[PDB]
Amino acid sequence: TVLDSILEGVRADVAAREASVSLSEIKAAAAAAPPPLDVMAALREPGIGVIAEVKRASPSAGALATIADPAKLAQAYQDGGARIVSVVTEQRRFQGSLDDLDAVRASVSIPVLRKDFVVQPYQIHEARAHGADMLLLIVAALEQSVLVSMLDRTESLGMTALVEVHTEQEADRALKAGAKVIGVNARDLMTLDRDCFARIAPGLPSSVIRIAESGVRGTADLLAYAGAGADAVLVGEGLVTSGDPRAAVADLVTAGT
Numbered sequence: 001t002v003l004d005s006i007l008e009g010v011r012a013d014v015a016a017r018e019a020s021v022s023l024s025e026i027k028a029a030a031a032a033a034p035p036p037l038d039v040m041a042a043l044r045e046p047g048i049g050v051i052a053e054v055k056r057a058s059p060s061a062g063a064l065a066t067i068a069d070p071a072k073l074a075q076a077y078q079d080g081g082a083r084i085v086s087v088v089t090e091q092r093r094f095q096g097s098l099d100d101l102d103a104v105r106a107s108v109s110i111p112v113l114r115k116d117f118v119v120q121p122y123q124i125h126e127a128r129a130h131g132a133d134m135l136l137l138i139v140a141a142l143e144q145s146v147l148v149s150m151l152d153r154t155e156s157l158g159m160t161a162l163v164e165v166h167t168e169q170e171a172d173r174a175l176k177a178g179a180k181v182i183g184v185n186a187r188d189l190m191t192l193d194r195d196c197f198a199r200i201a202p203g204l205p206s207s208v209i210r211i212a213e214s215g216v217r218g219t220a221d222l223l224a225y226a227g228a229g230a231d232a233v234l235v236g237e238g239l240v241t242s243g244d245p246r247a248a249v250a251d252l253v254t255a256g257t
């Protein structure tokens with residue numbers, strides 16, 4: 001599948017990074033990093049949280065933006081009222097890197113989500129070492145035992161897992177794994193194509209934070225997700241392509257007013 005191809009590339013890239021920066025070294029770096037921010041507290045703040053994303057490109061969109069200065073973009077995001085900044089760090093298909101994560105972490109006070117394809121423990125310590133407070137885990141990409149393992153390790157480092165699902169059954173798996181935050185991706189990663197959040201959201205325990213991860217083109221989309229019980233929404237394409245990201249974020253942040 002499309003997701004399979006991405007994971008194959010990811011596993012090779014992770015292995016090459018590990019050859020130059022050992023697991024022992026990255027574990028030490030993670031342990032030495034300032035503790036992660038309380039992501040759950042951020043997600044529980046009043047109002048629909050906007051998770052604004054740094055993303056240069058994607059399999060579905062192709063090239064979106066050059067983003068020569070991801071730190072400056074993230075600063076605009078925070079200025080606009082974003083709750084969390086998402087930073088894509090996958091290089092082959094999204095043209096992101098850990099350098100983007102470093103830049104953003106140094107530039108904003110809000111929590112930072114590492115958006116990548118996490119398949120092994122190295123990437124978790126790596127995320128923490130580079131200042132991530134939140135880490136994406138993709139149910140479609142992970143066998144249940146692996147998902148549970150990855151989630152446990154994420155939380156052991158003080159980070160919050162954004163557990164991404166595309167189906168009700170995946171939502172059920174996520175809950176069983178101990179997910180406290182569930183994101184719904186309207187895109188099928190196998191093929192790149194729902195009505196998803198609305199179908200899936202109602203079934204989640206009230207205690208679990210619900211995030212709509214895609215399809216936000218403006219306030220109307222955000223409000224529709226909110227009406228279906230979203231606690232936050234993730235927005236990338238519409239922001240990275242904006243000439244005025246601060247204003248575009250502020251518009252979404254104040255949606256419904």
Ligand SMILES: Nc1ccc(F)cc1C(=O)O
Nearest residue numbers: 058059060061187189192
């Ligand atoms: N936006 C995305 C998030 C995850 C993924 F596997 C592919 C895309 C892209 O749009 O095809």
